RNA sequence: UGCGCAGAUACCGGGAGGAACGCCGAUGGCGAAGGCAGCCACCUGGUCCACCCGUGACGCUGAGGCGCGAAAGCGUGGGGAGCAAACCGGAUUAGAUACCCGGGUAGUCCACGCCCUAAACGAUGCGCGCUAGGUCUCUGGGUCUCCUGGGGGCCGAAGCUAACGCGU
């Protein structure tokens with residue numbers, strides 16, 4: 091799955107300051123981690139639709155957070171995008 | 178890794194040569210699959226509740242291991258290959274849920 | 279009639295290898311006794327079912343028996 | 349011509365018939381009777397009377413082979429399943445034990461429309 | 465009708481193969497719906513509770529679109545035990561193109577691709593806020609006769625309804 095080790099590695103990579111766990115950046119990072127885990131899981135297991143729902147919703151939430159960061163401070167949006175390689 | 182329990186039931190007719198053979202065969206398989214053995218319980222001769230392979234008894238082995246998860250299934254395959262090995266069941270270890278405590 | 283949990287000690291509901299205790303939860307036949315007769319909780323029965331089935335695959339507890347009566 | 353003197357008596361009891369087999373302790377049969385073996389032909393075969401007379405015919409056929417001790421196995425439900433046992437007891441055969449081994453599936457095979 | 469002297473049925477032993485999981489089993493659980501019951505392991509989605517830690521309105525709905533979608537049915541290749549449309553018989557009957565009985569092909573199962581319906585039902589769209597309680601239950605937490613969340617039920621305040629009824 092996704093152990094707390096990998097998790098904290100990601101949170102700590104994207105934290106806007108130490109002790110930050112709820113940044114929009116940290117959020118879209120974590121989201122995109124599970125997104126890629128799920129998509130790789132769905133390259134095989136194509137016939138598993140009930141998880142595929144999970145993925146649709148995840149991309150939804152990711153795009154809402156990104157659409158927020160775009161509106162508020164676009165510079166950090168471009169930094170995040172360029173760091174994760176999205177869009 | 179995770180920590181599992183390997184139950185193995187084999188034919189209760191083996192002399193010392195064959196039993197030592199099947200057992201060190203299980204050792205070798207576990208080595209090849211990367212299983213660190215934390216403890217072992219050799220129960221041995223036990224009357225089965227029903228005939229298995231027409232044999233009314235079974236020789237019981239219980240292992241507690243820690244090993245890579247993605248290698249569990251393959252491991253079980255490798256175990257069931259032996260003729261003398263009759264039951265293979267690997268279970269993920271669990272906390273001993275008490276009742277009537 | 280007394281219930282099984284009532285007349286029993288502190289036992290591990292998850293241990294599939296303990297036949298001496300599990301055999302207390304089967305009927306005359308190999309069936310699993312309802313919670314009305316076992317005195318277990320919803321969760322407790324849910325766990326017992328699985329551990330009994332695991333033990334049945336090991337040849338430790340039977341799948342079914344024969345009724346000696348009638 | 350065998351002299352088993354002890355064995356098994358199987359009561360197969362359906363709603364359309366009751367038939368009795370009598371075997372040695374290893375399961376191999378000796379003699380048997382049924383609802384049609386005695387005179388009855390139609391629905392009258394599944395009656396408990398026919399169960400009695402079938403049981404007794406088979407028990408007398410067991411006497412000549414020397415049967416005294418008998419273990420009774422019972423498969424099925426139906427009229428005269430009990431009546432066949434009660435006939436088996438007063439048959440002069442000492443009944444060692446009685447078991448119900450009626451085969452029930454674990455929901456494996458789809459039954460006929462009649463049974464759903 | 466059918467099967468049985470080429471020895472069936474009933475019984476014991478060995479073997480093959482397909483399908484479905486008895487008891488647990490619930491008035492129970494999970495899921496967005498369709499739906500999901502042997503067991504083990506792997507991958508994997510949702511959801512709930514406690515802490516009050518982080519972001520700072522990022523929210524709700526949602527025409528189009530896209531994905532899912534019981535059964536039946538369609539295509540190719542498998543498979544094929546039991547059941548079983550069509551169909552072949554036997555009965556019943558005024559007739560029997562049926563209910564009942566003996567058979568039996570598709571199909572029911574697998575893979576991959578179609579099809580997109582339904583009493584697809586809670587015949588009750590989604591989200592939030594407010595409005596007595598009592599009782600049964602599933603599952604968390606707690607200073608654990610109880611208190612406090614989240615589901616599933618039954619009575620019922622205020623109120624609503626044509627009425628039946630609905631009623632945190």
Ligand SMILES: [Mg+2]
Nearest residue numbers: 257258259262
């Ligand atoms: Mg083997």
Ligand SMILES: [Mg+2]
Nearest residue numbers: 364390391393
């Ligand atoms: Mg008859």
Ligand SMILES: [Mg+2]
Nearest residue numbers: 425426427429
């Ligand atoms: Mg009755």
Ligand SMILES: [Mg+2]
Nearest residue numbers: 459462463464
């Ligand atoms: Mg039915």
Ligand SMILES: [Mg+2]
Nearest residue numbers: 467468469470
């Ligand atoms: Mg003939």
Ligand SMILES: [Mg+2]
Nearest residue numbers: 466467468469
């Ligand atoms: Mg003929």
Ligand SMILES: [Mg+2]
Nearest residue numbers: 467468469470
């Ligand atoms: Mg012929």
Ligand SMILES: [Mg+2]
Nearest residue numbers: 475476477478
């Ligand atoms: Mg047989």
Ligand SMILES: [Mg+2]
Nearest residue numbers: 479480481482
């Ligand atoms: Mg087989």
Ligand SMILES: [Mg+2]
Nearest residue numbers: 481482544545
């Ligand atoms: Mg075949």
Ligand SMILES: [Mg+2]
Nearest residue numbers: 487488489490
């Ligand atoms: Mg049930």
Ligand SMILES: [Mg+2]
Nearest residue numbers: 112516517518
């Ligand atoms: Mg705060």
Ligand SMILES: [Mg+2]
Nearest residue numbers: 112518519520
């Ligand atoms: Mg602030």
Ligand SMILES: [Mg+2]
Nearest residue numbers: 524525526590
């Ligand atoms: Mg929505």
Ligand SMILES: [Mg+2]
Nearest residue numbers: 526527528529
């Ligand atoms: Mg739409």
Ligand SMILES: [Mg+2]
Nearest residue numbers: 533534579580
């Ligand atoms: Mg469909």
